[PDB]
Symmetry: D2
Subunit: 452 residues, 4 copies
């Protein structure tokens, strides 16, 4: 990388954001003609979620939109990253549009523009329409075309007022956990060949969606991966190099959760070399036309980084420190991940990066004083943002940072047992209480991070 | 039932048969334009089959048809029950017919008619075309139409020479083990509502397939269930009634492996009442028209009976006797199952019955004398046929009995570790050796079971 | 408010803090072996070194007196003082605890000594541990050594810590050392040997100096739906219920024997092969007079008006180890135990696991721990107000330490320990607590 | 052909046939308790009654002589003769075995007594079983009691049956009594104690009458692919290989200590916490001279020229318990053992589980067992032809019986047992074997 220098710090037009996802916050899962999604069915299956929690109601954000928009303004957030519920706008996934569904996102986007908050719209954050699941979901050859139709509808109704789109959130997770480990919807444990087939169809879906998002008003399009940065043992050149190689490595026994497996097709138009020699029963035919479609020009790379892994000089994973600082969900705190992650991604692909998620699960409660004190989240945020500022100094093009999450919400298989919000939600009353971290982040934005 | 008494014994036209299934014997899994089926893929997944056995080659029946036909005639078998490989005649499951696949079954049927043996063709014995699995298989609303199209092709090409059809074999198992327990292809563990959805789509497929099989030549059409008969504690009326009720019972927590859940729809055009009360997420919509489609008139009920369970006077399950006679697969020998199973089915539905499978897994070997002695199989067959003869005497209309199997073969998740054959197969050489039970059965057929 | 002479304390256990597992002729304990068995502990952590408290006794004593703690609850490593579990006493082991107790008395801090905090000497484990008919006698000998060498200076003893856990987790579920999953009859045999062991240890501890003797249960209090009389009775009955299929973790299975001299009725009616013979003399031996009941309370469960446990509230406030925060537990637990047994209560453990770290400012901020303590202590103070006799409250723990099968992944300390340097850093909670003690809880 | 003095026998074990588990002062054993634990045994079968051989000794002896058996291998129930494992001898227990041995001698049948066939007295289990330092002494005492009451009329002794199984399955995998899953060091400790126990038992069995003393291993012979020297040597190496990750079920791990007075090399390099101290005195004690090596061989595995274990053939002939039929096992097992240890070999167990039943003709036809026996015995004959010292062959088993974790679901008998009525029906294999004995296997 070519350095930029410290002086400026964070860019003047840096998107200080917060992120949510449809299923995690919206509720009203069976209202206003919305079609079932795979998480509605998965979450209602005995044993799949922590204490059989589900997203039926969640934060009831569908009905409390106004209140949450006021929290965004109050905090002084520049950008709001959210996902559209495919099944809310297209109950069957294709064909008939649901106007009540469109109306909701319309009211959200008007509320955002009225408050001068830049919409960042995730098209797919895991809530596959159930009707499409009944037709084989991402195993179906037509799944790219289904997604394209959805993309077209998105652009049609929201292309006017929304200029930031992300096609897919974390294919590593929704394919890996959804279809390999089976812990996420729809809860399958499929063979390698089918994982490759699904990947291939998700990536082609991405291409077609990009094309659909290009028709009409100009906009910035992104793709978000789950990233677990390899943190080098030292600043020695060989150690950095080993961490870089390990970070972008993949093989037929361990690919679905990697960066390279997804980002190489998107950005370089090629899978990792190993893919070409796989001959397993039922492998998809991967063509040159496929790879051109997949690698449509996009504007930014989205990184979801929560933590990384310390590697040795040779790129092997170092044993975790005893009593290493950790979060409420069990993950370690590794501040340098928000340096090395963006750095290596910039070095490899030479693209603008947005941190589409960064946040911490904390055992938050309402204290006797009626407030929610989350110093651990503040320290986490403080530490991670310093590392991201260092990455910008060393010449990484970073255009935005999105705190996960605006609200405590339904954390997938962990239910409501993990609170990631800068805003606390009491689920008995649906009361919002802004946490200390919320005000901390507000001050950062107002000072554009100059005082970190 | 009105008895006929024990003078006549087995009817004059009784179909003495043996039974196989496509995937279990054919092999040639990747030849002659045959498309993949779910078992090709499932069996190649690590850990799914005993010692990773698969049906790639199986008994190589595809190439050794003439030797197998010769065994049939040498034994004097009246009828041969087999299944057609959907994926062999329709590689994508729909659309393009594969004429080399047709030619195989053509040469089988000609071979049979030439030897005066009556073909009993099963359409679906679990080998769903992989291409259709990728479209969601039986979860897909169109899966009935797929099957219908298959059935039409069946009728078109084989309706001339084949007069006995079975639409589905053991939906209890291919749905229950395929989609609930996940031990069989495609290896899923789906919620209750999806099992009902699959069941309903399978049953509608049956309806449509019957209609296709009715167009053109006249034939007899059946539907085969896996049945575990409840054997009453005694001949007292109340003990019998209790066994009857247990046998035909089902509920939302135990239905997929039951008789009534499948046979009530087919034969009486109604689900068990509990189904209409369920409202789980994403239950299929069951219409009056659906039930009329499902309940096309058919000519016989198929029962696959290997063993039953002894019940107390209240219909509760009695504890299995210590050291009860059992088989190599671990199942108990329960002779009375082949009396009570047919009897109760006869009483409930008043339809002709065929025993479409009965047989035993034995730890068979080639002895020093070069022969295969299976006296345990002989005794099993003798005892069960005695019981079937008694059912016929007590007024059960039984039109045939098919021994499972003609050949040792691929026994699904148990691979080649379970031999059910009246003919031994050495898989190293593909040598067939008719077992003692084969000659025993030959004698039964020639005497029409008069000497049992 | 809180009584004038209230034992404001903090608590630890030998294996969780000491380290120095293989020095000065200390014999092996079951945790030394168990912890070294791959897969038994989070990331194969072990207490070989732990907080190195063996070697940093002085520093930790200064923390105690800096916080102004009135009493220090700790356990004695049975294997450190009796390496084979019986016979030859090890004087270098005694020296350590002697040095500690001196340090405590020099700072005016009342020692509260737990005899058995789960670190069964391995040599005794090779002889069948608590399945052995002689196991009560082994303990008695250990309790006699304790009185001999420490009875002069120590007048608060706890025989056993959480029999629910070291038996239930150690021999039923198998998540704790020695990691067994034994039949019901052997669980009862173990329980009966432990309870007889307690009796004999009480008698040993009664010879010589006058002292207060206690017994500590892991208690999960049933919190009534409301203050309605019937909801309270339903909660009480649930709290003190037990049966053949769920007893090892209950209060009544252990405390009724100790305090009422009888097991729950169902225990006698069992006749599983190999069940121990429970005699009248056994029960008289078990039910020696003791001076207080120890309650380890972390959280409880809410019960409906019929005694049925309610489902945990969605998004309930919780701790870093996953447990819910249920403040009312430190009211109802003491109150119900007081009502049933009419003995003085000692809260021998109360605390919270937090995801603590050193912030950019070099301090350890644990506001959650502060709220937890504040809330729970309010409840205990209300129990006192309503006439419940509570003689002491010990915060778990003085130090972040080895949390058994969770290793070092759970920090319960009012003092943070960086395990890389063994540096102690007092958390905000430590100063909060200091202030609570100074004011005897009058500002809660 | 087969030698003139060949010991053509059949074999049983106490717990598998005797029943009468709770009578005539017999103490509990681990299998009494384990088998009553929910879900430990196939359909919760136990040996409370088994074949009721205790109460039907005459009938079973009559079958033994009817078959023309030359030797009868049985085990003595430790807990039947010493109800507490040590101390008071139970003379009603002794009487039974005295009656058995009388009935054998009376019928001209050579007794072959197994001391330990897995039924450890429960009292000793409570004292830590084979983990306890005194367990070799417990067994020594037992072996002295055996010699005292049976040394006059019994000249064939086997100290331990299948240490591979009772230690491997009993304490590593946990599928057999007592049902534990212990660390490597505790397995080696148990092995060492069993082995030392063996040594003391030999010395006890030497005091008085001269006798033949053996040690029985569970053996899985490696069958060379071909008769090539390379394939043979590779099979030999694999057959006697072991390592710290895979030793408890091997031959070398147990037989080297007994016969060569050394453990395999890898044992030197284990430094795990709790590892037993193996002294040279221990090794000399273990490695007492013995008269024969007992092999229990059911099947083997085929190894390529490299020594790598070959995959099982698709559709290989197998038994009702799932094992493959590998006739050559009863050639290479003896030969390789004979070459390594230069000791006389006794096939102390060989047979086949079959899905046997009473046919309509009222007979029990078991042609598979007949073929199995014929195929294996031909292979044993060929070993004797090639100069392997084999002193006898004992068909497992006389009766269908309690097959441990598989309960009564696996029938190994040459006599069928109907558990409803306890009727015995000699199978075709019994008669087949009778004929082989009368002809001394000349017609094989």
């Amino acid at each position: 990388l070519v350095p930029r220098g410290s002086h400026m710090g964070f860019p003047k037009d840096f998107l200080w954001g917060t992120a949510t996802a449809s299923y995690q916050i919206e509720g009203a899962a069976f209202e206003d003609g919305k079609g079932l999604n795979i998480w509605d069915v998965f979450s209602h299956q005995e044993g799949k979620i922590f204490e059989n929690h589900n997203g039926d109601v969640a934060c009831d954000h569908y009905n409390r939109l106004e209140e949450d928009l006021d929290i965004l303004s109050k905090l002084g957030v520049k950008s709001y990253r959210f996902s559209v519920s495919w099944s809310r706008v297209l109950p069957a996934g294709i064909g008939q549009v649901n106007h009540k569904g469109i109306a909701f996102y319309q009211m959200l986007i008007s509320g955002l523009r009225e408050r001068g908050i830049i919409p960042c719209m995730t098209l797919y954050h895991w809530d596959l329409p159930y009707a499409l699941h009944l037709k084989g979901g991402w195993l179906n050859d037509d799944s790219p075309n289904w997604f394209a139709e959805y993309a077209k509808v998105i652009k049609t109704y929201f292309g006017k007022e929304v200029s930031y789109f992300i096609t897919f959130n974390e294919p590593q997770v929704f394919v890996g956990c959804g279809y390999l480990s089976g812990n996420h919807a729809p809860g399958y444990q499929l063979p390698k060949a089918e994982i490759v087939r699904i990947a291939h169809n998700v990536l082609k879906a991405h291409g077609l969606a990009v094309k659909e998002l290009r028709k009409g008003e100009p906009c910035k399009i992104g793709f978000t991966g789950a990233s677990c940065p390899c943190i080098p043992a030292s600043d020695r050149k060989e150690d950095i190099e080993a961490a870089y190689n390990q970070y972008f490595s993949s093989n037929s026994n361990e690919f679905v959760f990697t960066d390279a497996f997804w980002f190489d097709p998107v950005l370089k138009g090629r899978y990792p070399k190993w893919v070409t020699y796989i001959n397993n029963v039922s492998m998809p035919i991967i063509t040159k036309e496929d790879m051109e479609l997949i690698s449509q020009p996009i504007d930014f790379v989205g990184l979801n980084i929560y933590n990384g892994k310390y590697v040795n000089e040779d790129g092997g994973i170092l044993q975790k420190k005893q009593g290493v600082p950790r979060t409420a969900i069990g993950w370690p705190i590794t501040q340098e991940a928000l340096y090395w992650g963006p750095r290596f991604t910039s070095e490899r692909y030479h693209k603008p990066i947005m941190i589409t998620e960064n946040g911490m699960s904390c055992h938050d409660c309402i204290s006797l004083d009626g407030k929610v004190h989350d110093e651990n989240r503040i320290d986490y945020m403080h530490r991670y943002l310093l590392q991201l500022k260092k990455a910008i100094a060393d010449g990484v093009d970073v255009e935005g940072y999105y705190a996960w999450s605006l609200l405590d919400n339904f954390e997938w298989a962990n239910g409501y047992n993990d609170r990631f919000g800068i805003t606390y939600v009491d689920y008995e009353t649906q009361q919002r209480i802004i946490k200390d971290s919320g005000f901390f982040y507000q001050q950062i934005i107002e000072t554009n991070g100059d005082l970190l």
